[PDB]
Amino acid sequence: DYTFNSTMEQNGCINEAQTWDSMIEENPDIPLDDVWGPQNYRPCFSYAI
Amino acid sequence: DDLIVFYEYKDLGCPRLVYYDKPWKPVVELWKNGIVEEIMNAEYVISE
Ligand SMILES: *[C@@H]1O[C@H](CO)[C@@H](O[C@@H]2O[C@H](CO)[C@@H](O[C@@H]3O[C@H](CO[C@@H]4O[C@H](CO)[C@@H](O)[C@H](O)[C@@H]4O)[C@@H](O)[C@H](O[C@@H]4O[C@H](CO)[C@@H](O)[C@H](O)[C@@H]4O)[C@@H]3O)[C@H](O)[C@H]2NC(C)=O)[C@H](O)[C@H]1NC(C)=O
């Protein structure tokens, strides 16, 4: 129960981004520290990724 | 005959929309270093 200010559009995500829930669902058992980070950043203004 | 076409979103993107029995010519733009600089006004052709 905590949300944010804007949506996926109105900021410029041309394609589907990466959000916290999808990243958590991605990594099953490992602590939250190694789930999402700068080694895993994929940009959303992408059109091709 | 039974010809089939495989659309590629990633190469192309969302395709344009035009309607039946309307005179249309595309508008083409020239880009230098990822910057819009001038509309192209020279002779060009299209094909399939
Ligand atoms: C802070 O966070 C914000 C987002 O919340 C970031 O803001 C965005 O940063 C992007 C990177 O600097 C800006 O880049 C855009 O990327 C688009 C890429 O699209 C290309 O399209 C061609 C085909 O034409 C492909 O070949 C390429 O591979 C790409 O897919 C560009 O289209 C886009 O250009 C314009 O952007 C304006 C933004 O107003 C649009 O109105 C316009 O229609 C067109 O899309 C641009 O180059 C992005 O603009 C920017 N967004 C905003 C709202 O600011 C910041 O970068 C983050 N801060 C830092 C320091 O990084």
Ligand SMILES: *[C@@H]1O[C@H](CO)[C@@H](O[C@@H]2O[C@H](CO)[C@@H](O)[C@H](O)[C@H]2NC(C)=O)[C@H](O)[C@H]1NC(C)=O
């Ligand atoms: C998100 O909510 C914030 C409120 O904090 C909005 O921020 C405003 O942005 C405008 C645009 O420049 C500023 O003039 C206001 O001063 C800002 N308000 C505040 C209280 O800081 C923002 O517009 C919202 N974003 C969206 C997409 O709705």
